[PDB]
Amino acid sequence: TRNIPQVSSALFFQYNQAIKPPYQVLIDTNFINFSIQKKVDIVRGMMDCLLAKCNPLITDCVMAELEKLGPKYRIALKLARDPRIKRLSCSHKGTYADDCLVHRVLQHKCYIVATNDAGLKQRIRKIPGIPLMSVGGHAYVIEKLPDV
Amino acid sequence: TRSSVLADALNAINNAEKTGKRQVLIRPSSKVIIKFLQVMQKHGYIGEFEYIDDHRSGKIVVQLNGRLNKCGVISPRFNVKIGDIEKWTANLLPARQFGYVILTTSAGIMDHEEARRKHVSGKILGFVY
Amino acid sequence: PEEMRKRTTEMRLMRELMFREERKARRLKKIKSKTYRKIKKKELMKNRELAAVSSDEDNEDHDIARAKERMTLKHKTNSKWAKDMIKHGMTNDAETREEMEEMLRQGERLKAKNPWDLLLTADDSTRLKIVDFKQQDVIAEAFAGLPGWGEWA
Amino acid sequence: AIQLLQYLGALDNKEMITEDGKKMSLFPLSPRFSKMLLVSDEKACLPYIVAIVSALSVGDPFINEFELRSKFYKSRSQFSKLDKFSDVFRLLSVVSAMDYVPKEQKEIFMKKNFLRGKLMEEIVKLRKQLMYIIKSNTSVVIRNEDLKSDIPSVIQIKLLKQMICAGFVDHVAVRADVLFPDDAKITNRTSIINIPYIPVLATRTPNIEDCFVYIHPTSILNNLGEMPPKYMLYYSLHLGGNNKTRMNTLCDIASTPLANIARKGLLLTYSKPLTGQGLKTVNLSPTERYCYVVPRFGSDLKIGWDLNPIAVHQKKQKGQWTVIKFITRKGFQTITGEEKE
RNA sequence: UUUUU
Ligand SMILES: [Zn+2]
């Protein structure tokens, strides 16, 4: 049987009419450094960037990467376990975080992706209606979220 | 020459933890050093430390438990107003509730949130987180 | 006894040996030519690869290595050294561009995801011991057809 | 002829017959085979060598494609299961397999598998005779049951490959792209049969293409589907119809086993100790050291090449560093450990 | 093509 995946009902051409405040945002592992490195707090750099209440989300795969890092990145590990950061369970064998994040956004058009990886960012860019959050300069920046 | 004994002490602590040493020796001593280490102890970052007099400035031997993610001094000791404190905490700490900025205020050496609660201000000694 | 003299000669030889690498190692230090060091490395890398001195990386180790590269992004042109060369036209030159390209590929390497050696001790003890001549040589005949170290030699 | 026996160890550098040479002459076979049996005593590998030795002594019982489609490869596939890089083991596969065939069914098995029968009967008879001379001279009624043998172990296979080497030390060939990559450019589209090889001890010609030799059509390697091994053993060289020299491959060999075997011959030399990170001349004493060396295998007028570096033991005999023993990587890595301790 | 202990 042939498969033609149905484009999500949350999408009108290129604008997602479903993503709305309070936003749910997936945290990428590299985001934590450029947050710590820039002295930008996770919860509120998001609020300042998006001017809304933001619910950060750490999946098992991104989490699984973090402890593998080791003592050098303990600060990143502890901030990941801040109780304000909710946890997402995963039911796929692989621990590669980039693939897991790309799948979740493919599945449901309700997440913001917080990452600075060029390769991952390009993959998310191809997927329509996925707001992409990044940290540059002094604070966070959101590109595909016109409600801003 | 020796300009800031406190800086040398804190640098010794950082090297000691980084190499995984459980104990480290600090020389020379100074009242500010004992107050700083007492603040660190109260926050739990550092364990027992003992003073050794020699009829000179003295020495410290401090036990270490690996809970110290970084500790440093702020030289020169800038004057800090109550309004300026949050600026310093934002600059020197990865997150405001992760770490403490230690101020020498008119009421003594003490961490920033204690200073806010007492409504006092002064100069800045350093930071620990 | 005399055995101490043998011991002294033993340390003497070792002391000779240590100096020699010291002179050689000391001289090699002063030569810091990029070409000379470049050739020495490439010979060294070949020898390691051919000899398989470096242990194979388990899948977990690759994951740890890939974890660091993603988690830092240390091998892209946003680094201080690379950015300086780009913004000032230093990478138009071929050699520096190569020094950039080797870095990028190194990062990309880390980013990658009827029923029908024990070496032979072929020494003489390993042989099958088979068991079976001068008079034949007598027939073969029937065919027909240190000195001088210290004394005069 | 003289040089060949010296390589085989039959004759010394003074052309005098060695003890091995005397033992070799006791056999009715060529020196190449006699050396094979001379080292076969290990790990009950003797029957396999005797089977192979008789097979190569009599010639191929196999019928080739030119002299003759699905059935042919079906028989070929059955006997190539032991190894995918050895034509020798195919002969071992067929010869040993025939011992399990009931007497009445040998002829049917023989025709079904495109096998030259008269060669096999002579093969069977010689395996008996070689099984007789061995038992008589080492201690004798020999039965057909004594010829029956089970599948070799993987260790036996690796050991057996080194048995073929000792009798064919001088018939090793290397892929040309390794030594001379500029002249021998191998692409993923290049056929295995057209991948050039260079025999050892081959005369240096002004044009190197004249020394290239290619895989014979009859080899399983032509149907291998992947890149052929690094080094290969050949039985003989034949001039193909396209003026291209073809070798009858025997089996593949790894470099380090090759060096161990050539160590006792005149075909192996050693470079100076290597230097660098990892490779360091560990010095036990003024007359002792452990170090890595590059074995240079083959005899500048001929074609020989260098092998992979190997960890070795050195002792200073009369001032010249001589190789006592080869060392594993773990053995060397430990050794540098105790001195640091 | 032959052919051998
Ligand atoms: Zn997952």
Q: How many residues does chain C have?
A: 153
- State the Cα–Cα distance between residues B99 and B43, nearest whole angstrom: 9
Which of D22, D50, D21 is closest to D36 using CA atoms?
Answer: D50
Distance D327 CA to E1 C1' (A): 51
- State the Cα–Cα distance between residues C92 and C94, nearest whole angstrom: 6
- Print the SS3 string covering chain D: CHHHHHHHCCECCCCCECHHHHHHHCCCCCHHHHHHHHCCCHHHCHHHHHHHHHHHHHCCCECCCCCCCHHHHHHHHHHCCCCCCCHHHHHHHHHHHHHCCCHHHHHHHHHHCCECHHHHHHHHHHHHHHHHHHHHHHCCCCCHHHHCCCCCCHHHHHHHHHHHHHHCCCCEEEEHHHHCCCCCCCCCCCCHHHCCEEECCEECCCCHHHHCEEECCCCHHHHCCCCCCCEEEEEEEEECCCCCEEEEEEEECCHHHHHHHHCCCCCEEECCCCCCCCCCCEEEECCEEEEEECEEECCCCEECEECCCEEEEEEEECCEEEEEEEECHHHHHHHHHHHHC
Q: How many residues does chain B have?
A: 129
Handedness of CA D120, D122, D128, D129 (dihedral sign): negative
- State the Cα–Cα distance between residues A93 and C59, nearest whole angstrom: 14
CATH number of B69-129: 3.30.1490.10
Tokens of C77: 């042109």
C50 → chain D, closest CA residue: D308
Q: Are B122 and B105 in contact (CB under 8 A)?
A: yes
Which of D103, D97, D86, D88 is closest to D55 using CA atoms?
Answer: D88
CA distance readout (Å), A125 to A27, A49, A133: 16, 19, 11
CA distance readout (Å), A17 to A9, A20, A113, A141: 9, 8, 17, 20
Three-class secondary structure of residue B5 per DSSP? helix
Beta carbons within 10 angstroms of residue B78's beta carbon:
10
| DSSP assigned state of C64 | H
- Sequence-distant (≥ 6) Cβ neighbours of residue D283 within 8 angstroms: C14, C17, D289
Q: Are B30 and B5 in contact (CB under 8 A)?
A: yes
Strand order in the sheet with D295-297: D268-270, D295-297, D305-306
CA dihedral D105, D107, D108, D112 (to 10 degrees): 140
CATH architecture for the domain at B1-68: 2-Layer Sandwich (3.30)
Pairing label, strands A111-114, A132-136:
parallel
Chain centre distance of CA C69: 29
C69 → chain A, closest CA residue: A30
Handedness of CA D304, D306, D312, D318 (dihedral sign): positive
- State the Cα–Cα distance between residues D90 and D77, nearest whole angstrom: 9
The Cβ-side half-sphere exposure at B37, using a 13 Å CA radius, reads 24
Window 6-65 of C, Cβ < 8 Å to A? 63-64
Give chain D positions within 8 Å (CB) of C54. 278
- State the Cα–Cα distance between residues B85 and B124, nearest whole angstrom: 9
Token pair 């240096």 is found at D204
CA dihedral A14, A17, A22, A23 (to 10 degrees): -30
Please name the nucleotide lying closest to D58, CA to C1'. Answer: E4
| DSSP assigned state of B43 | T
Please name the nucleotide lying closest to D57, CA to C1'. Answer: E4
What counts of helices (H) and strands (E) characterise chain B? 4, 8
Which of A54, A65, A64 is closest to A131 using CA atoms?
Answer: A54
- State the Cα–Cα distance between residues D40 and D38, nearest whole angstrom: 6
- Sequence-distant (≥ 6) Cβ neighbours of residue D168 within 8 angstroms: D32, D233, D234, D235, D250
Give the Å distance between the CA of A90 and the centre of ligand 1: 4
Measuring alpha carbon to C1', the residue closest to nucleotide E3 is: D58
Distance D94 CA to E2 C1' (A): 26
- Sequence-distant (≥ 6) Cβ neighbours of residue B26 within 8 angstroms: B8, B9, B12, B13, B33, B59, B60, B61, B62
- Vertex D245 angle, CA D240 and D249, to 5°: 105
Three-class secondary structure of residue C29 per DSSP? helix
Q: Is C73 left (phi over 0), alpha (psi -120 to 50) or beta?
A: left
Strand E close residues, chain D 164-203, CB < 7 angstroms: none
| DSSP assigned state of B55 | S
Q: How close A24 comes to chain B (CA, Å)?
A: 21
Pairing label, strands B59-63, D172-175:
unpaired
Tokens of D14: 């003074």
Give the Å distance between the CA of A102 and the centre of ligand 1: 10
Phi then psi dihedrals of residue C121, to 5 deg: -75, 75
- Tell me which amino acid residue C23 is: R
Beta carbons within 10 angstroms of residue C114's beta carbon:
13
Give the Å distance between the CA of A59 and the centre of ligand 1: 6
CA distance readout (Å), D43 to A90, D25, D40, D322: 53, 24, 8, 29
Distance B92 CA to E4 C1' (A): 95
Three-class secondary structure of residue B104 per DSSP? strand
Give chain C positions within 8 Å (CB) of D137. 130-132
Three-class secondary structure of residue B30 per DSSP? coil
Token pair 């600075």 is found at A116
- Sequence-distant (≥ 6) Cβ neighbours of residue D74 within 8 angstroms: none
Three-class secondary structure of residue B102 per DSSP? strand
- State the Cα–Cα distance between residues D191 and D320, nearest whole angstrom: 47
Token pair 């990062």 is found at C107
C108 → chain A, closest CA residue: A119
Q: Are D297 and D259 in contact (CB under 8 A)?
A: yes
Pairing label, strands B71-73, B122-128:
antiparallel
Instruction: Specify which residues A136 forms β-bridges with.
Output: A139
The answer to whether D56 CB is within 7 Å of strand E is no
- State the Cα–Cα distance between residues D165 and D151, nearest whole angstrom: 21
Beta carbons within 10 angstroms of residue B107's beta carbon:
14
Distance D58 CA to E2 C1' (A): 14
Q: Are A97 and A65 in contact (CB under 8 A)?
A: yes
Handedness of CA C72, C75, C78, C84 (dihedral sign): positive
- State the Cα–Cα distance between residues B81 and B39, nearest whole angstrom: 21
Pairing label, strands A54-59, A86-88:
parallel
Chain centre distance of CA B101: 8
CA distance readout (Å), D277 to C11, C28, C38: 26, 14, 15
The answer to whether D59 CB is within 7 Å of strand E is yes
Tokens of C83: 């950015």
Give chain C's radius of gyration (CA, Å): 32
CB contact under 8 A, C116 and D151: yes
- State the Cα–Cα distance between residues D161 and D30, nearest whole angstrom: 19
- State the Cα–Cα distance between residues D142 and D131, nearest whole angstrom: 7
Distance D51 CA to E4 C1' (A): 19
- State the Cα–Cα distance between residues D10 and D12, nearest whole angstrom: 7
Indicate the helix (H) or strand (E) that contains B49: strand B49-52
- State the Cα–Cα distance between residues D61 and D115, nearest whole angstrom: 5
Of C10, C13, C120, the CB nearest to D159: C120
Distance D146 CA to E5 C1' (A): 24
Phi then psi dihedrals of residue A108, to 5 deg: -145, 130
- State the Cα–Cα distance between residues C76 and D138, nearest whole angstrom: 71
Pairing label, strands D202-203, B108-111:
unpaired
Separation of first and last alpha carbons in chain B: 28
| DSSP assigned state of C130 | -
Q: Are D51 and D127 in contact (CB under 8 A)?
A: yes
Count contacts between A and B (CB, < 8 Å): 15
C76 → chain A, closest CA residue: A118
Distance A48 CA to E2 C1' (A): 97
The answer to whether D28 CB is within 7 Å of strand E is yes
CB contact under 8 A, A98 and C70: yes
Which of A138, A135, A129 is closest to A28 using CA atoms?
Answer: A135
- Vertex D193 angle, CA D187 and D195, to 5°: 40
Tokens of D305: 């090449």
Of D39, D274, D286, the CB nearest to C127: D39
Q: Are C131 and D138 in contact (CB under 8 A)?
A: yes
Experimental approach taken: cryo-EM
Q: What share of chain C is helix, strand, coil (3-state, %, to 5)?
A: 65, 0, 35
Q: Are B94 and A76 in contact (CB under 8 A)?
A: no
CA distance readout (Å), B27 to B30, B31, B62, D293: 9, 13, 11, 53
Nucleotides of E under 7 A from a protein CB: 3-5
Token pair 């068991």 is found at C131
- State the Cα–Cα distance between residues A140 and A121, nearest whole angstrom: 15
Give chain D's radius of gyration (CA, Å): 22
Ion ligand 1, residues whose Cβ is below 5 A away: A 59, 61, 90, 100
- State the Cα–Cα distance between residues D177 and D230, nearest whole angstrom: 10
Phi then psi dihedrals of residue C97, to 5 deg: -60, -40
Tokens of A87: 């946890």
Q: Are A76 and A65 in contact (CB under 8 A)?
A: no
Give the Å distance between the CA of D241 and the centre of ligand 1: 62
Strand order in the sheet with D172-175: D197-199, D172-175, D231-239, D245-252, D214-215
**Contact with chain C for residue A69, Cβ under 8 A:** yes
Q: Are B124 and B73 in contact (CB under 8 A)?
A: no
Give the Å distance between the CA of C129 and the centre of ligand 1: 66
- Print the SS3 string covering chain A: CCCCCCCCCCEECCEECCCCCCEEEEECHHHHHHHHCCCCCHHHHHHHHHCCCEEEEEEHHHHHHHHHHCHHHHHHHHHHCCCCCEEECCCCCCCCHHHHHHHHHHHCCCEEEECCCHHHHHHHHHCCCCCEEEEECCEEEECCCCCC
Pairing label, strands D197-199, B108-111:
unpaired
- Sequence-distant (≥ 6) Cβ neighbours of residue C64 within 8 angstroms: A68
- State the Cα–Cα distance between residues D299 and D3, nearest whole angstrom: 11
Q: Are B124 and B101 in contact (CB under 8 A)?
A: yes
Beta carbons within 10 angstroms of residue C153's beta carbon:
7
Which of D267, D256, D255 is closest to D229 using CA atoms?
Answer: D255
Tokens of A54: 């933001």
Most A-contacting residue of C62, C70, C77 (CB-CB within 10 A), to test interface:
C70
**Contact with chain C for residue D132, Cβ under 8 A:** no
Q: Are D141 and D131 in contact (CB under 8 A)?
A: no
Burial letters D169-184, b for 16+ CB under 10 A, else e = bbbbbbbbbeebeeeb
Residues of chain B with CATH 3.30.1490.10: 69-129
Which of D20, D92, D24 is closest to D56 using CA atoms?
Answer: D92
Measuring alpha carbon to C1', the residue closest to nucleotide E5 is: D28
Beta carbons within 10 angstroms of residue B7's beta carbon:
15
- State the Cα–Cα distance between residues D329 and D312, nearest whole angstrom: 10
Tokens of D323: 């190789």
Chain centre distance of CA C75: 28
Q: Is A129 left (phi over 0), alpha (psi -120 to 50) or beta?
A: left
CB contact under 8 A, C50 and D309: yes
Residues of chain B with CATH 3.30.1370.30: 1-68
Of A73, A96, A119, the CB nearest to C71: A73
Tokens of D145: 């049951």
Phi then psi dihedrals of residue D274, to 5 deg: -75, 165
Most A-contacting residue of C62, C66, C69, C71 (CB-CB within 10 A), to test interface:
C71
| DSSP assigned state of B72 | E
Q: How many residues does chain A have?
A: 148
Which of C65, C78, C56 is closest to C106 using CA atoms?
Answer: C65
- State the Cα–Cα distance between residues D251 and D83, nearest whole angstrom: 9
- State the Cα–Cα distance between residues D3 and D20, nearest whole angstrom: 16
Resolution of this model in Å is: 3.9
